[PDB]
């Protein structure tokens, strides 16, 4: 039967993971690969070549989402889609996102070796970017596929990176958005245009490893939000301005960072998280009192309302701190505040069947990280396959998933794609 015939080239997949990690602005073992940069362009070509070698028909949309299709026996039907991203935040690992892209191509190669003949077409999606590094916008590609008019409008009119390079200029530099007359609405997919969407991904947590399980069947994705905060003071000479006359924007930021921690812990749930991953002082000189501070805050919960309470408290603390410190709260912006998504019940059932037929132990579990799957769920039934990762590490170079774990995930992906294709 099909399950018993599935064979992955595990060392070969690992070789591709290692090769792709070479396209990086950080020295190995770290990876940095930001949307539309030269390293991103080289990684795209590498992946598109693999898609072509796998016999896929390759196309790209206006923002550089890349699609590789294996035409089915009934090609007019909504296809079964799978994929992930290949961008990497500064000094991160080689497996986040990449496993679900290279592993999806390997799943196609695995199904072909087994002589599987899809009824519904299978389509692999390389999402143009999932990480918010360049423009502050996470899942830029999938948010657009899911039809966000507000994002399309923003990308055309206002969005720039930290070097004031516009989204359009950056996209065009990479070979995309070459139609001046496109409001980017051309990227939008109709609801139901895919029968289902699957994403293979490392767990980014220690659960599967700690429990000794092979596969996680994802049931939902937690609700993510991000905030940008700026404080402004008078600054001046660190040696000469006596303490009673100061309004130190850096100390306001320090206090807000600690308040973020406090409000997260106030939720009384271990599922609530909040982080200050960016805190910048201006002018940023040892002997200059900071006159501006900038914080970027990530906060999430499986419960949307509980997360929103944290956000409201953070805003209250930012105002209280500004008044006490005598600084201006010059910016408090909610960059995104998104709902959680539920995986489709029939997709979950097929994934769990797949794991069982492959003799792979599994559990149903929630994803704490967000993924392109979060937005694809607005377009079609969605599910995710988690594989174990070492100590749960992710977003750091110690991130690791074994060749066998990756192959197990690929086999589950192949078998779930096959079940959905032959609905």
Contacts of 323 (CB under 8 A, 6+ apart): none
- By beta-carbon proximity to a second copy, the closer residue of 25 and 353 is 25
* Residue 242 partner contact from a second copy, Mn ion, ligand UGC, none using kind-dependent CB cut-offs of 5 to 8 Å: a second copy
Q: Taking a C-beta distance cutoff of 8 angstroms, is the pair 141, 235 a contact?
A: no
Task: Give the distance from CA 43 to its chain's centroid.
Answer: 17
**Smallest separation, CB 228 to a second copy (Å):** 9
Alpha carbon distance 112, 104 (integer Å): 12
**Smallest separation, CB 388 to a second copy (Å):** 13
* Residue 31 partner contact from a second copy, Mn ion, ligand UGC, none using kind-dependent CB cut-offs of 5 to 8 Å: none
Alpha helices in 114-211 (DSSP H): 140-145, 149-157, 167-173, 207-211
* Residue 68 partner contact from a second copy, Mn ion, ligand UGC, none using kind-dependent CB cut-offs of 5 to 8 Å: none
End-to-end C-alpha distance for the chain, whole angstroms: 17
- By beta-carbon proximity to Mn ion, the closer residue of 335 and 346 is 335
- By beta-carbon proximity to Mn ion, the closer residue of 202 and 251 is 202
214 is a contact residue toward Mn ion (CB under 5 A): no
- By beta-carbon proximity to ligand UGC, the closer residue of 21 and 121 is 21
366-375 in b/e form (b: 16+ CB < 10 A) is bbbbbbbbbb
Residues that bind ligand UGC (CB under 6 A): 96, 130-131, 204, 237-239, 287, 369-371, 394
Q: Taking a C-beta distance cutoff of 8 angstroms, is the pair 384, 199 a contact?
A: yes
Task: Give the distance from CA 333 to its chain's centroid.
Answer: 21
Token pair belonging to 314 = 């953070």
**Smallest separation, CB 222 to ligand UGC (Å):** 9
**Smallest separation, CB 354 to a second copy (Å):** 24
Strand-pair partners of 299: 225, 274
- By beta-carbon proximity to a second copy, the closer residue of 111 and 289 is 289
Q: If binding means CB under 5 A, how many residues of this protein chain bind Mn ion?
A: 2
Contacts of 15 (CB under 8 A, 6+ apart): none
- By beta-carbon proximity to ligand UGC, the closer residue of 204 and 408 is 204
- By beta-carbon proximity to ligand UGC, the closer residue of 7 and 245 is 245
**Smallest separation, CB 357 to a second copy (Å):** 29
* Residue 143 partner contact from ligand UGC, Mn ion, a second copy, none using kind-dependent CB cut-offs of 5 to 8 Å: none
Longest dimension (CA), the chain: 80
Instruction: List C-alpha distances in Å: 190 to 62, 83, 147, 193, 289.
Output: 16, 18, 8, 5, 53
Angle (CA) 194-153-176 rounded to 5° is 65
Strand ranges inside 121-213, DSSP E: 122-127, 194-202
* Residue 209 partner contact from Mn ion, ligand UGC, a second copy, none using kind-dependent CB cut-offs of 5 to 8 Å: none
Which DSSP helix (H) or strand (E) runs through 230?
strand 223-232
Residues that bind a second copy (CB under 8 A): 89-92, 131-133, 136, 138, 204-205, 222, 224, 226, 234-244, 248, 250-251, 253-255, 257-258, 261, 264-265, 270-273, 275-291, 296-298, 300, 368-370, 392-396
- By beta-carbon proximity to ligand UGC, the closer residue of 354 and 369 is 369
- By beta-carbon proximity to ligand UGC, the closer residue of 207 and 238 is 238
Instruction: List C-alpha distances in Å: 330 to 63, 291, 292.
Output: 32, 11, 9
The contact mask relative to Mn ion for 79-108 (x = CB under 5 A, - = no) is -----------------xx-----------
* Residue 134 partner contact from Mn ion, ligand UGC, a second copy, none using kind-dependent CB cut-offs of 5 to 8 Å: none
Alpha carbon distance 48, 59 (integer Å): 9
Point out which residues bind Mn ion (CB under 5 A): 96-97
């Amino acid at each position: 039967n099909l399950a018993s015939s599935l064979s992955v080239d595990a060392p070969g997949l690992q070789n591709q993971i290692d090769e792709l990690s070479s396209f990086s602005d950080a020295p190995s073992p770290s990876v940095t690969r930001v949307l539309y940069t030269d390293k991103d362009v080289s990684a795209r070509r590498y992946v598109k070549n693999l898609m072509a070698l796998a016999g896929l028909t390759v196309r790209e949309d206006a923002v550089g989402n890349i699609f590789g299709k294996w035409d089915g026996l009934e090609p007019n039907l909504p296809a079964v889609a799978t994929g992930s991203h290949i961008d990497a935040i500064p000094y991160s690992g080689k497996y986040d996102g990449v496993v679900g892209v290279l592993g999806a191509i390997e799943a196609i190669n695995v199904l072909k070796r087994s002589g599987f003949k899809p009824k519904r077409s299978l389509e692999i999606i390389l999402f143009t970017s999932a990480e918010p590094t360049r423009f502050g916008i996470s899942c830029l590609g999938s948010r657009l596929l899911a039809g966000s008019k507000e994002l399309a409008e923003a990308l055309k009119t206002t969005v720039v990176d930290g070097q004031n390079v516009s989204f359009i200029e950056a996209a065009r530099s990479a070979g995309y958005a070459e139609d001046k007359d496109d409001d980017l609405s051309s990227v939008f997919l109709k609801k139901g245009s895919y029968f289902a969407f699957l994403e293979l991904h490392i767990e980014q947590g220690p659960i599967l490893e700690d429990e000794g399980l092979d596969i996680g069947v994802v049931t939902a994705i937690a609700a993510p939000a991000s905030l940008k905060v700026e404080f402004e003071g008078n600054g001046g000479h660190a040696g000469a301005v006596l303490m009673p006359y100061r309004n130190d924007a850096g100390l306001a930021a320090a206090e807000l960072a600690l308040a973020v921690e406090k409000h997260v812990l106030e939720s009384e749930s271990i599922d609530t998280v909040g982080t200050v991953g960016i805190l910048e002082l201006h002018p940023g000189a040892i002997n200059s009192i900071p006159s501006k501070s900038h914080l970027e805050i990530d906060t999430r919960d499986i419960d949307e309302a509980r997360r929103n309470t944290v956000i409201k408290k953070i805003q209250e603390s930012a105002n209280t701190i500004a008044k006490k410190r005598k600084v201006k709260l010059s910016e408090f912006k909610i960059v995104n505040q998104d709902p959680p998504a539920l995986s489709d019940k029939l997709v979950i059932k097929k994934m769990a069947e797949a794991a069982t037929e492959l003799n792979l132990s599994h559990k149903m579990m929630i994803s704490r990280a967000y993924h392109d799957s979060l937005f694809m769920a607005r377009i079609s039934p969605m599910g995710m396959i988690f594989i174990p990762c070492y100590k749960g590490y992710s977003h750091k170079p110690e991130e690791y998933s074994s060749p066998e774990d990756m192959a197990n995930g690929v086999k589950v992906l192949s078998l779930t794609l096959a079940k959905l294709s032959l609905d």
